[PDB]
Amino acid sequence: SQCSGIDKRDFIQGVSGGTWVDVVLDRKGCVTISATGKPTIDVRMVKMEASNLASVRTYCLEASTSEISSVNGCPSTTEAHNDKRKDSTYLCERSYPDRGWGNGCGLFGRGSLDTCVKFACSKKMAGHAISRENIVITAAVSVHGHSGAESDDRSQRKSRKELAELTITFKSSIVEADLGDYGKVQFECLMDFGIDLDDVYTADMSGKWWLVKRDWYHDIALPWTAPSADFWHDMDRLVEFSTPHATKQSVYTLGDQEGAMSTALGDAAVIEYMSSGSKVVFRTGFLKCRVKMENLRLKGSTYMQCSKEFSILKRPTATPYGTVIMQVKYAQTDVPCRVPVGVHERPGGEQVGRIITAHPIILQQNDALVIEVEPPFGDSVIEIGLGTTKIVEQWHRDGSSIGAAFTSTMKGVERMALLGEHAWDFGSVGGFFNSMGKAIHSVFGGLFRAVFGGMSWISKVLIGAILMWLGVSAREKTLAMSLITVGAILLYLSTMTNA
Amino acid sequence: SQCSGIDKRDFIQGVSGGTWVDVVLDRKGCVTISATGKPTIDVRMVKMEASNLASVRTYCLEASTSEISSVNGCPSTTEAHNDKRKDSTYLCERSYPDRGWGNGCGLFGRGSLDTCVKFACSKKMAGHAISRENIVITAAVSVHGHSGAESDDRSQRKSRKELAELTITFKSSIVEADLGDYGKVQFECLMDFGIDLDDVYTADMSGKWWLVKRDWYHDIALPWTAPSADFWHDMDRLVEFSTPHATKQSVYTLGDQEGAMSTALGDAAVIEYMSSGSKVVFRTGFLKCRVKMENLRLKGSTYMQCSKEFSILKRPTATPYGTVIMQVKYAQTDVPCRVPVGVHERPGGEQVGRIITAHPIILQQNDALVIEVEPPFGDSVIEIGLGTTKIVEQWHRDGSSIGAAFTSTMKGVERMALLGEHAWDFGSVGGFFNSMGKAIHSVFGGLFRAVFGGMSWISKVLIGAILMWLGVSAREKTLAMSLITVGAILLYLSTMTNA
Amino acid sequence: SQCSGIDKRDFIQGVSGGTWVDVVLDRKGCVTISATGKPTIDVRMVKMEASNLASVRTYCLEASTSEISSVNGCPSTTEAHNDKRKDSTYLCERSYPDRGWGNGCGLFGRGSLDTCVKFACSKKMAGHAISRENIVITAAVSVHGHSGAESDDRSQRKSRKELAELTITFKSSIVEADLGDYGKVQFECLMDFGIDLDDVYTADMSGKWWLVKRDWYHDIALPWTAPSADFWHDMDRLVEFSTPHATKQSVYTLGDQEGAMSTALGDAAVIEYMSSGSKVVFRTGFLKCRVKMENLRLKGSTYMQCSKEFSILKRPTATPYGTVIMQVKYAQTDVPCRVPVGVHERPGGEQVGRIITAHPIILQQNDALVIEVEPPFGDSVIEIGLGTTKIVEQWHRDGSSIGAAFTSTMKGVERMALLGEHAWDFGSVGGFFNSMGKAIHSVFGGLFRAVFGGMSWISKVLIGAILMWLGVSAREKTLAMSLITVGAILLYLSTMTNA
Amino acid sequence: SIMIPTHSTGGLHQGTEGWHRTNNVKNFLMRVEKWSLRNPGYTALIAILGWTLGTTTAQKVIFIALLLMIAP
Amino acid sequence: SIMIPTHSTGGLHQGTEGWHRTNNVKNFLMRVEKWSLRNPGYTALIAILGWTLGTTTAQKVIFIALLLMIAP
Amino acid sequence: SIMIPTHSTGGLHQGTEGWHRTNNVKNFLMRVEKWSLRNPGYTALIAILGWTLGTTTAQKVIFIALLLMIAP
C-alpha cells in the first residue's frame, strides 16, 4: 500500500531497456517502483503465517508429587521391593540406609529402602512443527496518481482497483494484480525465505511462542511425554530424593524452571499466535518477488490539462525520508483532467529535482489528490497549476549531499550487506559482477559462515577484540589474509548492527 | 542416648590425673568418655533450634500484571504523560514510536507513548533473621552399666535416672545432669558454633528453607518490598514491554524464577522448619562442652559378685566401629550383684583387649543387661561369669593394625582437621602444643582462610590443578614456602573430603 | 573314627610337658594323638553344614517372548507411542525405519516404530546367602586299644563309649567327649575357617550349587528380579530386535546361557545340597583346635598280663604309610587281661621301632583286637604273646630313610605350607618361633597375598615363566630382594602344588 | 546459560526489542566488576599467574580477561 | 549463579546430599565435551591461538581449558 | 570370564577335580597351535614385529607369546 508513513523505504529507478526488476521485501521495508512513461507503483509485504501445525513433544515444568510410600529391609539379604514400583505413573528409587538395633532389626549393617511417588504436571512446553507447504504470505500493490473523494477508505480504494491484494500461496507462486485500467502486473518470487523451515520448532510455554532450533529443543533435560497423551517417561529430572535416615524419606521438587527457560530461549524470534484458525505470524522472513512490468500503461493520457485553480489541504509537510507530501483538491467542472506538477529552483526556472507521482489525474468534481515530490538540497519551489492562479509553495530541505551519500552507504552496509547471497540482488548489473558474487558467496555461505554456531554478542565482542589485538601484534603480514576474514565491514557489523 | 548403632563415633580414654575433659559434639557424632575408676557415660547432641525470628525482606517471584493503559503523543513538543504515573502501584515507562500521517497526526516525525501497568505478586521469597541469643540446643546423656527388665523403654530409662536430659539454653550456659545415684556431671561450654550468626538469613521459598548469606540475600536482583506492608520498589525487574508500534504496547512477565532461584541456591545448608512454635532446626552446628567428672561415682561397688549362670539373649554381633554387643540375662535370686566380665585371647589366659562397660550391676531378679566389648585384632574369647558355668563365646575380628592406624589418620584428617581452630580441641596436652596451635590458627583463620570467600568445588579443583602444574614447573624452591600455603592436607581436602 | 585306610594321615607325637596339642583338620585328613602314659586317640571331622539360607537375587537364563505388537508413524513429527508401554511386563523399544511412498505415507523421510513384547523366563539362577552363625560342624573321636566281638559296628562302638561324636555348633564351642572309663577330652576351637562367610553366595542353577563371590555374582549381566515375588526388571539383556524394515519387527532371544555360566563359574568350590532340611555340605572348610588330655587315663592298667595263646585273623598287611595292621583274637578264659605287644629286631632282643596302639586290653572271652605297628626300615619281628606259644610274624618294610625324609619334606611343603599362617599350627614350639611366624604371616596375608586376587593357573604359569626369565637376565642384583617374594616354595606352588 | 553463549546464533535479529532485553550488555559487566571488587584474592591470584607466565603484557591481558569472564 | 561459582563458599558441606546434587560434577563435563565436539570452529581458533602464543607446551593446555571454560 | 582367567582367585583348590576340568591344560595349547597353523599371515607379521623391536632375542619371544595369546 502507501509507503509514506514508514521510514525504511527503498527507491528503485527501474531500467529503461528492461521491463522487470528484482525486489526484496520485508515486513517493515517497502520499495517504490517508478519507471519513465509508466505509472509508479508501491509493493508491500503484509504478513507471513502458517496454517496447519503438527505436534512434536510437550515437556513438563512443574512437578506435583501427591502420594508417597515406603518399605524397609533389614540387613538380611532380602531387600525391599515396593509394589508401587510396577505402575507407570510412579517414580521410585531404592536406597540403603543404616539400620541398627534401635530401629528393631537385630543386626548392625546397611538396610534397604524403596519409596515411590505419584507424578503429575501442571505446566508444559508444547512444541510444534511447521510444514513448508502451508505458509500463505500476502502482499499489497498500489498505484500513484488516482484521486477520489476526501472521505474514502481502503475498501473504496480496492473497489476502484488501485490497491489490489495478493495471496502468494505455496502452490500458486505466480499471481496477477488487476489494477483496473492501469493494466496488470505479475510476480515471479521463489520459495527462498530467511526462516529455514523443516529445521525449527515453535516452543509454546504460557501463550508466548518462539522459533527455536530443532536440535536444541531436542537436547533439553526435562520430563517429556507424547503429544497424544501425557504419559511422562523421564520423570526423574524434576523430583529429588532427600537423605534416607531410617525407613522413611522425603521428596522435593525443583521449582518451575519457567524463568530459566524464558532466559535461555530469550532471544529467538518471538512469533505471534492468532487464534480462531491456529495461525502463527513469522514477522521475520523475506520475499524476493520479480515485477514484470509489461502491461503497465497510463490510465489518463488523452485527457486535457486542468486549467482552473486548486484548493490546498494538508499544507506540505516533510517525510522522514525527506520527500514533500501535499493534498490538493479540485472544485470546478472541467473534469476529468491531468494535473500539471513542476519543481523548479526558482519561480519560472528550469526543472530540477525528482517528481515521484506519475500522472495526477482527477476523474470527478471534488477529489483530494495526494502529491509527493522529492526536492533538491538547495532552495526550490513546488508549483502546482497551469494558469495565473497556481500553488507556488517553496521548500528549503536543509541538508548536505556528502552527508546523504554517507547515510546511503551506512544504510546499505546495514541492510543489503546482510542476508548473505541476497546482498547483490537489488538489481541486474552486467559484466558478470552479480553472477560471480553469487557464485563465490554460495560456497562462502556453505562453509565458514553457517557450518558452525553457538555465538552471542558478548562472545562476538570478546573474540573480535582478541582479533584486533592479535592482528596489530602480528608478523609475516597476516593482515593480507585476515582482511578477507575480518575487516572493517565485519567490525562495523559486530559493533553497531546485528544488535 | 545409646551410641552403638551409629557408624561415626569418637572414643576418649580420659585422663587419670584431671577430672575434666573437653569434647566436641555434633548432630550425628557421639563421644564415649571413660575414666579409670568412673562409670563411662554417653553424651549425644540432639538438635538445635531458634525460637523467634524477625523478617528482613520478602522478594517477588511471579508477577501478575493485570491492568494496562496507554496514552499517545503527537510530534508536537508536549509529550505523553499518563495520569497513572502519580500512583505507586503501577509500573509505567515512556517510549517514542514512529508516528506519521496514516496514524492521524498531520506531521512526520517521532511521536510519544507512555504506558502504565499494574503490578501484583503471587509468590514471595520470605526472608528472616536469627538472633544469636535465642538458640535452644538440647543434649542427652546416658550411663553404661545399669540393667532392667527386657520390657522397658526410654520412659523407664529416664524414670530410673539413667537417661538424663539436658537443655542448654542461651542464658544458662552451665547445666548439671541428674544421672541418678551415679552422681552428677556438669558442662561448661560457651557460644562458639561453626555457623557465623548475625551473618546469614533464612530464605523461605515454598516451604523449603535455606541458610543464605546476608549480603548474598541483599544482592539478588528481583522486585522486593518491606515485610510490614507490601510496597514494591524494583517493579521493573520482572515486567517487560513489547515493541511500541503505534499508540499501543503489550506487557510480558518473565515466568516464575523459582527454578532459577532453587538452582543458584542449591548447596547451602537446608534447615528444617517445624510449625506450631515457629522453630527452625539447624542440623549443622557443633557444641564444645568440657565434661567435669568430679561428682561421678560407681553405683554398685559394695555388692557381691554374681556366682550363678547367665542366659544369653541376642548372641553377640559386630558393630560398624568394631565392638561386639551382647545382652545377657540373670534369673537367679542372689541379687543385687556385680557381674564379672573379662576378655582373654584364650580361655584361662591373660586379659587382653579393652572393655567398654564399667560395672554391670543387676539390681533385679529377672533382667537383661547389655555388654559392649572391644576385642583385639587376633582371636579372643569373651567370658561372662565367675564359676564353671560361664559364657565363653569367642570372636575373630578380622582386621589389621596398620590398617586401623591408617583409617584413624583418615578419620582425623577428615573430621577433626575441619572446624579450623577447633581442630586441636579434643583435649588438653602439655608442652604448649595445643595452645600454640590455637594461637597460630587464630590468625590463620583471621586472614587467608575466613577473611576471603567465593570458592566452589569446580573452581577449587581448577585452582588445585593450576597449583600442581605451577609447582611442578617451578624453580627457586617455591614449594618449600608453598607446602605451608598448599601442602598435602589441603589438597586432600580439596579432592576427597569436604564433599 | 578309625584312621587306617586314609593315606593323608598325620602322626603327632604329643607333648611331654603340657596336656594339649593344636591340630588342624581337613575333611579328608586325619591325625593321631599319642601322649606318654595315655591311650592314643584318633580325631576326625565329618562334615560342615549350614541350616538356614536367605534368598538374595534370582537371575534369568532362558527368555520366552510370547506376544508382540507394533505401531507406525508417518514422517510427520508426531511419533508412534505404543499403548503397551504402560505395562511393566512388556519389553518395548522404539526404532526409526525408512518410510516412503510405497508404505502409504505421502512424504519421503524416516518414520517411527514401537514394538512391545511380553517377557517370560523359564530357568532362574536362584542365589542364596549363608549366615556366619548357623553352620554346625561335627567331628568324631575314637580310642585305640579296646577290643570287642568280631561282629559289631559303630552302634556297638558308641554303646561301649569308645566312638564319642561331637557337634561343634556356632554357639557351644566347648564340648566334652565321654569316652567311658578313659576319662574326657575337650576342644577349644574358634570361628576361623578356610571359607570366608559374609563374602560369598550360593549359586543354585539346575540343582548344581556353588560358593561364588558376592561381587562377581553382583556383576553378572542378566535379567534379575526380587526373590519375594518374581517379575524381571532388566529385561533387555536377553531380547534383541531384528532390522525394522517397515511397520514390523521380529523378536529374537539369545539362547539359555546355562553353558556359558557353567563354563565361566565352572571351577569355584562345589558345595552340595541335602534336601529335607535345606542343609548344604561345604566340603572345603577346616577346623583348628587343641585337645586337652588332662582327664585321659588308661582303662586297663591293674589287669594281669595275658598268659595263653592267641588266634590269628586277617593276617598282617601293610598300609599306604607303611604301618602294619593285625587282628588277633583271644579264646581262653583268663580275661580281662592286657595283651603284651613288642617289636624286636631279632627274636628275644632289644625293642626297636614304634608301637601305635596303647594298651590292648580284652575284657571278654572271644574278642577281636586290631593292632597297629610301625616297624623299622630293616628286617624286624612282631611278637604278640607272653609264653612260648606266641605269634612271631615278621616283616621287611623295604624302604630308604632318605626317601622317607624326602617324602616328609614334600608333604610338609605341599599340604602344611598352604593355609597361609595356619602352616605353623601343627604343634607348639618355644623360642618365640610360632609367635613371630604367625605375626609375619598376618601382614603377609594382609598385603600382596590375600588383599586382592585374580590368578588362575594359566596366568600363574605365564607370570612364573616371565619371572624366571627376568631373574635369569637380572642386573643390579634384584635376586636378593626377589628370593623372599618368589623362590622355590612359591614356584613349586605354581607348578605342581595347589593342583 | 552462564558459560555457553546465548541462543543469538540463529541469525534472527531484527528491529524489534522487548522491555528488558538491552540491559544485559551492561548487566554482565556490572556483575563481573561487583564480583571482582568483592573478591580480591582470586583476582590477585590471576594477576600473579598472568605476570608469571608470558611476560609480554600483550596476551596476559587476554588471559586475565578470560579468567575473569569464566569466574562468576 | 550462571557464571558465578556455586554457593559452596560457606564451607557448610556435610553428609546430607541429594541424588540430583552429586551428578553435577559429571553433568558439567558431559556438557563441556558435547559442546566441544559440536563446535569445531571455536576449538580450531583456540588451538591456533595456543600454538601461536606460549610455545612451551606447558601452559597451552591451560589456554585451551580456560577458553573452553568461557565457551560452552 | 572368557578373556578373564578362570575363577581360581578364591584359593579354594582341593583334591577334587573332574575329567572335564583337567583337560584345559592341553585343550588350550591344542586350540592355540591349530589356529596358529591355520593362520600364517598373523604369525608372519608378529615375527616381523618381534625382529623389528627389541633386537635382544629375549623380549621378542615374550612378544610372540603374548600375540599368540591375545590371538588364539
PDB file of all heavy atoms in Angstrom, chain A residues 48-71:
ATOM      1  N   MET A  48       3.302 -13.008   7.031  1.00  0.00           N
ATOM      2  CA  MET A  48       3.514 -14.419   6.738  1.00  0.00           C
ATOM      3  C   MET A  48       2.910 -15.244   7.862  1.00  0.00           C
ATOM      4  O   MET A  48       3.081 -14.916   9.040  1.00  0.00           O
ATOM      5  CB  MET A  48       5.001 -14.747   6.601  1.00  0.00           C
ATOM      6  CG  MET A  48       5.477 -14.877   5.172  1.00  0.00           C
ATOM      7  SD  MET A  48       7.092 -15.660   5.053  1.00  0.00           S
ATOM      8  CE  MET A  48       8.104 -14.391   5.798  1.00  0.00           C
ATOM      9  N   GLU A  49       2.208 -16.319   7.506  1.00  0.00           N
ATOM     10  CA  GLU A  49       1.541 -17.117   8.528  1.00  0.00           C
ATOM     11  C   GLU A  49       1.299 -18.531   8.021  1.00  0.00           C
ATOM     12  O   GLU A  49       0.715 -18.718   6.950  1.00  0.00           O
ATOM     13  CB  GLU A  49       0.218 -16.467   8.950  1.00  0.00           C
ATOM     14  CG  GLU A  49      -0.626 -15.947   7.802  1.00  0.00           C
ATOM     15  CD  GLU A  49      -1.706 -16.927   7.388  1.00  0.00           C
ATOM     16  OE1 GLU A  49      -1.915 -17.922   8.113  1.00  0.00           O
ATOM     17  OE2 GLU A  49      -2.341 -16.705   6.338  1.00  0.00           O
ATOM     18  N   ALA A  50       1.754 -19.513   8.793  1.00  0.00           N
ATOM     19  CA  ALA A  50       1.407 -20.904   8.557  1.00  0.00           C
ATOM     20  C   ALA A  50       0.023 -21.201   9.125  1.00  0.00           C
ATOM     21  O   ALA A  50      -0.487 -20.487   9.994  1.00  0.00           O
ATOM     22  CB  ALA A  50       2.446 -21.836   9.178  1.00  0.00           C
ATOM     23  N   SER A  51      -0.588 -22.273   8.627  1.00  0.00           N
ATOM     24  CA  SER A  51      -1.952 -22.626   8.998  1.00  0.00           C
ATOM     25  C   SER A  51      -2.043 -23.918   9.794  1.00  0.00           C
ATOM     26  O   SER A  51      -2.648 -23.937  10.869  1.00  0.00           O
ATOM     27  CB  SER A  51      -2.825 -22.730   7.739  1.00  0.00           C
ATOM     28  OG  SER A  51      -4.203 -22.671   8.071  1.00  0.00           O
ATOM     29  N   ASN A  52      -1.460 -25.004   9.297  1.00  0.00           N
ATOM     30  CA  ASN A  52      -1.554 -26.309   9.934  1.00  0.00           C
ATOM     31  C   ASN A  52      -0.223 -26.657  10.585  1.00  0.00           C
ATOM     32  O   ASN A  52       0.827 -26.592   9.940  1.00  0.00           O
ATOM     33  CB  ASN A  52      -1.947 -27.386   8.921  1.00  0.00           C
ATOM     34  CG  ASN A  52      -3.428 -27.702   8.955  1.00  0.00           C
ATOM     35  OD1 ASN A  52      -3.861 -28.630   9.637  1.00  0.00           O
ATOM     36  ND2 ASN A  52      -4.216 -26.926   8.220  1.00  0.00           N
ATOM     37  N   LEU A  53      -0.273 -27.027  11.864  1.00  0.00           N
ATOM     38  CA  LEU A  53       0.910 -27.365  12.637  1.00  0.00           C
ATOM     39  C   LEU A  53       0.786 -28.783  13.173  1.00  0.00           C
ATOM     40  O   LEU A  53      -0.310 -29.234  13.522  1.00  0.00           O
ATOM     41  CB  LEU A  53       1.107 -26.385  13.797  1.00  0.00           C
ATOM     42  CG  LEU A  53       1.361 -24.926  13.410  1.00  0.00           C
ATOM     43  CD1 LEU A  53       1.010 -24.005  14.564  1.00  0.00           C
ATOM     44  CD2 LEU A  53       2.805 -24.728  12.981  1.00  0.00           C
ATOM     45  N   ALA A  54       1.915 -29.485  13.236  1.00  0.00           N
ATOM     46  CA  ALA A  54       1.975 -30.845  13.750  1.00  0.00           C
ATOM     47  C   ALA A  54       2.698 -30.850  15.088  1.00  0.00           C
ATOM     48  O   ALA A  54       3.780 -30.269  15.214  1.00  0.00           O
ATOM     49  CB  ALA A  54       2.681 -31.774  12.761  1.00  0.00           C
ATOM     50  N   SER A  55       2.100 -31.504  16.080  1.00  0.00           N
ATOM     51  CA  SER A  55       2.708 -31.583  17.401  1.00  0.00           C
ATOM     52  C   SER A  55       3.980 -32.420  17.355  1.00  0.00           C
ATOM     53  O   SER A  55       4.135 -33.313  16.517  1.00  0.00           O
ATOM     54  CB  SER A  55       1.723 -32.182  18.403  1.00  0.00           C
ATOM     55  OG  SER A  55       0.481 -31.501  18.369  1.00  0.00           O
ATOM     56  N   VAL A  56       4.902 -32.121  18.268  1.00  0.00           N
ATOM     57  CA  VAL A  56       6.181 -32.822  18.300  1.00  0.00           C
ATOM     58  C   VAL A  56       6.365 -33.510  19.645  1.00  0.00           C
ATOM     59  O   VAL A  56       6.402 -34.743  19.721  1.00  0.00           O
ATOM     60  CB  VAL A  56       7.344 -31.855  18.021  1.00  0.00           C
ATOM     61  CG1 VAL A  56       8.679 -32.569  18.168  1.00  0.00           C
ATOM     62  CG2 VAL A  56       7.204 -31.238  16.642  1.00  0.00           C
ATOM     63  N   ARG A  57       6.473 -32.719  20.714  1.00  0.00           N
ATOM     64  CA  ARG A  57       6.674 -33.260  22.053  1.00  0.00           C
ATOM     65  C   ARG A  57       6.463 -32.182  23.109  1.00  0.00           C
ATOM     66  O   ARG A  57       7.071 -31.108  23.033  1.00  0.00           O
ATOM     67  CB  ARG A  57       8.074 -33.865  22.184  1.00  0.00           C
ATOM     68  CG  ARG A  57       8.376 -34.419  23.558  1.00  0.00           C
ATOM     69  CD  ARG A  57       9.482 -35.459  23.500  1.00  0.00           C
ATOM     70  NE  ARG A  57      10.718 -34.926  22.945  1.00  0.00           N
ATOM     71  CZ  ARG A  57      11.882 -35.562  22.969  1.00  0.00           C
ATOM     72  NH1 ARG A  57      12.003 -36.760  23.518  1.00  0.00           N
ATOM     73  NH2 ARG A  57      12.952 -34.979  22.435  1.00  0.00           N
ATOM     74  N   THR A  58       5.615 -32.452  24.096  1.00  0.00           N
ATOM     75  CA  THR A  58       5.321 -31.500  25.160  1.00  0.00           C
ATOM     76  C   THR A  58       6.111 -31.883  26.404  1.00  0.00           C
ATOM     77  O   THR A  58       5.991 -33.009  26.900  1.00  0.00           O
ATOM     78  CB  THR A  58       3.826 -31.460  25.470  1.00  0.00           C
ATOM     79  OG1 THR A  58       3.484 -32.561  26.319  1.00  0.00           O
ATOM     80  CG2 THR A  58       3.014 -31.550  24.188  1.00  0.00           C
ATOM     81  N   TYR A  59       6.916 -30.951  26.906  1.00  0.00           N
ATOM     82  CA  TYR A  59       7.744 -31.194  28.080  1.00  0.00           C
ATOM     83  C   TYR A  59       6.930 -30.915  29.344  1.00  0.00           C
ATOM     84  O   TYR A  59       5.708 -30.750  29.302  1.00  0.00           O
ATOM     85  CB  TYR A  59       9.011 -30.347  28.013  1.00  0.00           C
ATOM     86  CG  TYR A  59      10.104 -30.948  27.157  1.00  0.00           C
ATOM     87  CD1 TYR A  59       9.803 -31.842  26.140  1.00  0.00           C
ATOM     88  CD2 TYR A  59      11.435 -30.626  27.371  1.00  0.00           C
ATOM     89  CE1 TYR A  59      10.798 -32.392  25.357  1.00  0.00           C
ATOM     90  CE2 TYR A  59      12.432 -31.175  26.596  1.00  0.00           C
ATOM     91  CZ  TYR A  59      12.111 -32.056  25.590  1.00  0.00           C
ATOM     92  OH  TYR A  59      13.107 -32.601  24.816  1.00  0.00           O
ATOM     93  N   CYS A  60       7.603 -30.868  30.492  1.00  0.00           N
ATOM     94  CA  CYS A  60       6.968 -30.532  31.758  1.00  0.00           C
ATOM     95  C   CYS A  60       7.841 -29.535  32.506  1.00  0.00           C
ATOM     96  O   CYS A  60       9.063 -29.511  32.342  1.00  0.00           O
ATOM     97  CB  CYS A  60       6.728 -31.773  32.624  1.00  0.00           C
ATOM     98  SG  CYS A  60       6.124 -31.417  34.291  1.00  0.00           S
ATOM     99  N   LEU A  61       7.199 -28.711  33.335  1.00  0.00           N
ATOM    100  CA  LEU A  61       7.907 -27.637  34.021  1.00  0.00           C
ATOM    101  C   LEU A  61       7.691 -27.680  35.529  1.00  0.00           C
ATOM    102  O   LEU A  61       8.603 -27.359  36.297  1.00  0.00           O
ATOM    103  CB  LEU A  61       7.471 -26.282  33.464  1.00  0.00           C
ATOM    104  CG  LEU A  61       7.825 -26.009  32.002  1.00  0.00           C
ATOM    105  CD1 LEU A  61       6.972 -24.882  31.445  1.00  0.00           C
ATOM    106  CD2 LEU A  61       9.302 -25.685  31.859  1.00  0.00           C
ATOM    107  N   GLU A  62       6.498 -28.073  35.966  1.00  0.00           N
ATOM    108  CA  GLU A  62       6.148 -28.085  37.382  1.00  0.00           C
ATOM    109  C   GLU A  62       5.785 -29.501  37.800  1.00  0.00           C
ATOM    110  O   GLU A  62       4.954 -30.149  37.153  1.00  0.00           O
ATOM    111  CB  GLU A  62       4.992 -27.126  37.670  1.00  0.00           C
ATOM    112  CG  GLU A  62       5.096 -26.423  39.012  1.00  0.00           C
ATOM    113  CD  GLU A  62       3.789 -25.798  39.451  1.00  0.00           C
ATOM    114  OE1 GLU A  62       2.725 -26.403  39.206  1.00  0.00           O
ATOM    115  OE2 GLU A  62       3.823 -24.698  40.042  1.00  0.00           O
ATOM    116  N   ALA A  63       6.403 -29.977  38.877  1.00  0.00           N
ATOM    117  CA  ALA A  63       6.102 -31.288  39.430  1.00  0.00           C
ATOM    118  C   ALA A  63       5.071 -31.166  40.544  1.00  0.00           C
ATOM    119  O   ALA A  63       5.062 -30.198  41.308  1.00  0.00           O
ATOM    120  CB  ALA A  63       7.371 -31.956  39.961  1.00  0.00           C
ATOM    121  N   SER A  64       4.200 -32.168  40.634  1.00  0.00           N
ATOM    122  CA  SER A  64       3.067 -32.158  41.553  1.00  0.00           C
ATOM    123  C   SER A  64       2.961 -33.488  42.292  1.00  0.00           C
ATOM    124  O   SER A  64       1.904 -34.121  42.330  1.00  0.00           O
ATOM    125  CB  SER A  64       1.770 -31.849  40.812  1.00  0.00           C
ATOM    126  OG  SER A  64       0.667 -31.838  41.699  1.00  0.00           O
ATOM    127  N   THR A  65       4.075 -33.938  42.866  1.00  0.00           N
ATOM    128  CA  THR A  65       4.094 -35.180  43.633  1.00  0.00           C
ATOM    129  C   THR A  65       3.030 -35.155  44.723  1.00  0.00           C
ATOM    130  O   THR A  65       2.996 -34.241  45.551  1.00  0.00           O
ATOM    131  CB  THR A  65       5.477 -35.395  44.249  1.00  0.00           C
ATOM    132  OG1 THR A  65       5.588 -34.629  45.454  1.00  0.00           O
ATOM    133  CG2 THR A  65       6.564 -34.960  43.279  1.00  0.00           C
ATOM    134  N   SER A  66       2.165 -36.169  44.721  1.00  0.00           N
ATOM    135  CA  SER A  66       0.994 -36.196  45.589  1.00  0.00           C
ATOM    136  C   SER A  66       1.065 -37.299  46.638  1.00  0.00           C
ATOM    137  O   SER A  66       0.940 -37.022  47.834  1.00  0.00           O
ATOM    138  CB  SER A  66      -0.276 -36.353  44.740  1.00  0.00           C
ATOM    139  OG  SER A  66      -1.401 -36.632  45.552  1.00  0.00           O
ATOM    140  N   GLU A  67       1.265 -38.545  46.223  1.00  0.00           N
ATOM    141  CA  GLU A  67       1.237 -39.684  47.127  1.00  0.00           C
ATOM    142  C   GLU A  67       2.639 -40.255  47.304  1.00  0.00           C
ATOM    143  O   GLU A  67       3.465 -40.208  46.390  1.00  0.00           O
ATOM    144  CB  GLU A  67       0.293 -40.773  46.609  1.00  0.00           C
ATOM    145  CG  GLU A  67      -1.179 -40.430  46.767  1.00  0.00           C
ATOM    146  CD  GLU A  67      -2.081 -41.627  46.560  1.00  0.00           C
ATOM    147  OE1 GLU A  67      -1.749 -42.716  47.073  1.00  0.00           O
ATOM    148  OE2 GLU A  67      -3.125 -41.479  45.892  1.00  0.00           O
ATOM    149  N   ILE A  68       2.895 -40.794  48.496  1.00  0.00           N
ATOM    150  CA  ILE A  68       4.192 -41.353  48.843  1.00  0.00           C
ATOM    151  C   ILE A  68       3.988 -42.715  49.494  1.00  0.00           C
ATOM    152  O   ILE A  68       2.903 -43.045  49.975  1.00  0.00           O
ATOM    153  CB  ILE A  68       4.997 -40.417  49.775  1.00  0.00           C
ATOM    154  CG1 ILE A  68       6.500 -40.616  49.574  1.00  0.00           C
ATOM    155  CG2 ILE A  68       4.613 -40.643  51.228  1.00  0.00           C
ATOM    156  CD1 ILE A  68       7.333 -39.448  50.046  1.00  0.00           C
ATOM    157  N   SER A  69       5.054 -43.512  49.491  1.00  0.00           N
ATOM    158  CA  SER A  69       5.039 -44.833  50.102  1.00  0.00           C
ATOM    159  C   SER A  69       6.466 -45.202  50.477  1.00  0.00           C
ATOM    160  O   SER A  69       7.427 -44.595  49.998  1.00  0.00           O
ATOM    161  CB  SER A  69       4.435 -45.882  49.164  1.00  0.00           C
ATOM    162  OG  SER A  69       4.146 -47.082  49.858  1.00  0.00           O
ATOM    163  N   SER A  70       6.595 -46.202  51.347  1.00  0.00           N
ATOM    164  CA  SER A  70       7.908 -46.632  51.803  1.00  0.00           C
ATOM    165  C   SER A  70       7.861 -48.104  52.186  1.00  0.00           C
ATOM    166  O   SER A  70       6.807 -48.649  52.521  1.00  0.00           O
ATOM    167  CB  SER A  70       8.397 -45.792  52.987  1.00  0.00           C
ATOM    168  OG  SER A  70       8.481 -44.422  52.644  1.00  0.00           O
ATOM    169  N   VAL A  71       9.030 -48.737  52.134  1.00  0.00           N
ATOM    170  CA  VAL A  71       9.192 -50.126  52.552  1.00  0.00           C
ATOM    171  C   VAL A  71      10.658 -50.335  52.901  1.00  0.00           C
ATOM    172  O   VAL A  71      11.551 -49.908  52.164  1.00  0.00           O
ATOM    173  CB  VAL A  71       8.702 -51.106  51.458  1.00  0.00           C
ATOM    174  CG1 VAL A  71       9.323 -50.764  50.115  1.00  0.00           C
ATOM    175  CG2 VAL A  71       9.011 -52.542  51.848  1.00  0.00           C
TER     176      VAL A  71
END
